Design a protein around this ligand. Structure first.
Ligand SMILES: *[C@@H]1O[C@H](CO[C@H]2O[C@@H](C)[C@@H](O)[C@@H](O)[C@@H]2O)[C@@H](O[C@@H]2O[C@H](CO)[C@@H](O)[C@H](O)[C@H]2NC(C)=O)[C@H](O)[C@H]1NC(C)=O
Ligand SMILES: *[C@@H]1O[C@@H](C)[C@@H](O)[C@@H](O[C@@H]2O[C@H](CO)[C@@H](O)[C@H](O)[C@H]2O)[C@@H]1O
Ligand SMILES: *[C@@H]1O[C@@H](C)[C@@H](O)[C@@H](O[C@@H]2O[C@H](CO)[C@@H](O)[C@H](O)[C@H]2O)[C@@H]1O
Ligand SMILES: *[C@H]1O[C@H](CO)[C@@H](O)[C@H](O)[C@@H]1O
Ligand SMILES: *[C@H]1O[C@H](CO)[C@@H](O)[C@H](O)[C@@H]1O
Ligand SMILES: *[C@H]1O[C@H](CO)[C@@H](O)[C@H](O)[C@@H]1O
Ligand SMILES: *[C@H]1O[C@H](CO)[C@@H](O)[C@H](O)[C@@H]1O
Ligand SMILES: *[C@H]1O[C@H](CO)[C@@H](O)[C@H](O)[C@@H]1O
Ligand SMILES: *[C@H]1O[C@H](CO)[C@@H](O)[C@H](O)[C@@H]1O
Ligand SMILES: *[C@H]1O[C@H](CO)[C@@H](O)[C@H](O)[C@@H]1O
Ligand SMILES: *[C@H]1O[C@H](CO)[C@@H](O)[C@H](O)[C@@H]1O
Ligand SMILES: *[C@H]1O[C@H](CO)[C@@H](O)[C@H](O)[C@@H]1O
Ligand SMILES: [Mg+2]
Lengths: 106, 48, 210
């Protein structure tokens, strides 16, 4: 199945940068492992290199403005042909949940 | 200053591969072991 | 008010890459009609791009894996230097992984040695550590996440010389304790090693697509 072939993967944001063109197979696009591919412009940009974890995203806002709450941050495994640390396929998500406190008293 | 070292029956020589040559899995261990002998002799010397 | 238009497409460029995929481009000009005193602007794009496929594989440089486990802390031509004032050494190894297609080889020392004392299974005293920092709410996205902090029986490391100075090239090497000791301490809450406590995390947000 053909796919959109991009020339660069940002990794810092998981975006597909530098569109090379479309109408080409995935095996041909990832012959250069520095490239990246995505289906149309819906998202989920996968680089053609070895799968490696991205950077932890910023903490989501605390679920409550009062007392103790909980906040999340994500990290996406991005790559091609292989797995991240933990038998993780490219595209899966990993979360860290931490107790937050915007205001200590309600 | 005309000293010359003659290769004889008491001399021992073995090749030490360069950095890029060390990446073969069998020459990996050679560059490992040749590096341990390096640090071993200088710091601990001999108990003899 | 003259309407401009495109001219003939020039020669196509060869595939600039010898491996994988590249980009060739064709170029045209708006030189035959030319917009005069206004008009439009030839309408469209004067540059076409096309992908060329050489159908031959291409490289990737190997990366260092994480450092392995430290070897046992021993001394040459001596037995176990455990629970003794005898500084030893221990080694550690790395593995170059991912190098394919004539890629650049891993750069750096794949072996690592440091000096050490041996407290493997050495009976020592201990004292309860303070409450550790609250961990993560686990399981995330799962039913009812809970944190966890703990106090543990921390061994009282013996006051040995942290640095041993050798000559030859006047080399001083840091000495680091290695091994799993047996910390002795009074019971706290019916436990001798580690006593922890959990608290549920409040107002847990749902895990959705970014
Ligand atoms: C071995 O120790 C040296 C010396 O620095 C540390 O030495 C300890 C004995 C102790 O006094 C500790 O407080 C001290 O930091 C390390 O070299 C560097 O030294 C400077 C000067 O104090 C420190 O600020 C650095 O943190 C320290 N480490 C660096 C720059 O990486 C040395 O790193 C350490 N390990 C090895 C392998 O030599
Ligand atoms: C953020 O600011 C706080 C000061 C509150 O106004 C929050 O609203 C809600 O107020 C009720 C009490 O009226 C609390 O029980 C809630 O915890 C709090 O979320 C506001 O979101
Ligand atoms: C042409 O012959 C091939 C057999 C390879 O050796 C090619 O090398 C590769 O060229 C492209 C850019 O031209 C780079 O992306 C690769 O990193 C490089 O290895 C050669 O050009
Ligand atoms: C998130 O966690 C730490 C930084 O807080 C690093 O392991 C890395 O940056 C990861 O993305
Ligand atoms: C979340 O926590 C703080 C901000 O509240 C920072 O360390 C950083 O923004 C992190 O993503
Ligand atoms: C140039 O491009 C196309 C023909 O290639 C038309 O839109 C028009 O002729 C324009 O001048
Ligand atoms: C270039 O493209 C086509 C021919 O390939 C035509 O529209 C025209 O000749 C243009 O110059
Ligand atoms: C091993 O050594 C340290 C971690 O102890 C880092 O430099 C790196 O993780 C390396 O693989
Ligand atoms: C060796 O040293 C300690 C264990 O004594 C840890 O930092 C780690 O296990 C390393 O491999
Ligand atoms: C930990 O608990 C108390 C101190 O809180 C003492 O019995 C002793 O120090 C033990 O290690
Ligand atoms: C944890 O609990 C309190 C502080 O919250 C103290 O008794 C002590 O710091 C302990 O480690
Ligand atoms: C966890 O809870 C709070 C921080 O949220 C503090 O009492 C301390 O950091 C503890 O480890
Ligand atoms: Mg002697």
């Amino acid at each position: 199945d053909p796919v959109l072939c991009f020339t660069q993967y940002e990794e810092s944001s998981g975006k597909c940068k530098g569109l090379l063109g479309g109408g080409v197979s995935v095996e041909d696009c990832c012959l250069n492992t520095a490239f990246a591919y995505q289906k149309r412009s819906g998202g989920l940009c996968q680089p053609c290199r070895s799968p490696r974890w991205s950077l932890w995203s910023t903490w989501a806002p605390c679920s409550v403005t009062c007392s103790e709450g909980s906040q999340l941050r994500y990290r996406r495994c991005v790559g091609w042909n292989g797995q991240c640390s933990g038998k993780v396929a490219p595209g899966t998500l990993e979360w860290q949940l931490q107790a937050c406190e915007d205001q200590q008293c309600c | 200053p005309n000293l010359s070292y003659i290769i004889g029956k008491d001399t021992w020589v073995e090749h030490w591969p360069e950095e890029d040559e060390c990446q073969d899995e069998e020459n990996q261990k050679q560059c490992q072991d040749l590096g341990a002998f390096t640090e071993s002799m200088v710091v601990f010397g001999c108990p003899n | 008010g003259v309407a401009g238009g495109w001219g003939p497409w020039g020669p196509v460029s060869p595939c600039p890459v010898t491996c994988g995929l590249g980009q060739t481009m064709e170029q045209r000009t708006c030189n035959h009609p030319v917009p005069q005193h206004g008009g439009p602007f030839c309408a469209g794009d004067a540059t076409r791009t096309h992908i060329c496929n050489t159908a031959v594989p291409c490289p990737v440089d190997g990366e260092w894996d994480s450092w392995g486990e430290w070897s046992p802390c021993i001394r040459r031509n001596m037995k176990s230097i455990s629970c003794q004032e005898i500084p030893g050494q221990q080694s550690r190894g790395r593995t170059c992984r991912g190098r394919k297609f004539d890629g650049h080889r891993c750069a750096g020392q794949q072996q690592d040695i440091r000096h050490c004392y041996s407290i493997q299974h050495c009976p020592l005293k201990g004292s309860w550590s303070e409450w550790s920092t609250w961990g993560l709410c686990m399981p995330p996205c799962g039913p009812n996440p809970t944190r966890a902090r703990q106090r543990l029986c921390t061994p009282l490391l013996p006051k040995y010389p942290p640095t041993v100075s050798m000559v030859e090239g006047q080399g001083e090497k840091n000495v680091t304790f290695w091994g799993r000791p047996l910390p002795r301490c009074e019971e706290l809450q019916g436990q001798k090693l580690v006593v922890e406590e959990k608290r549920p995390c409040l107002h847990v947000p749902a895990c959705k697509d970014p």
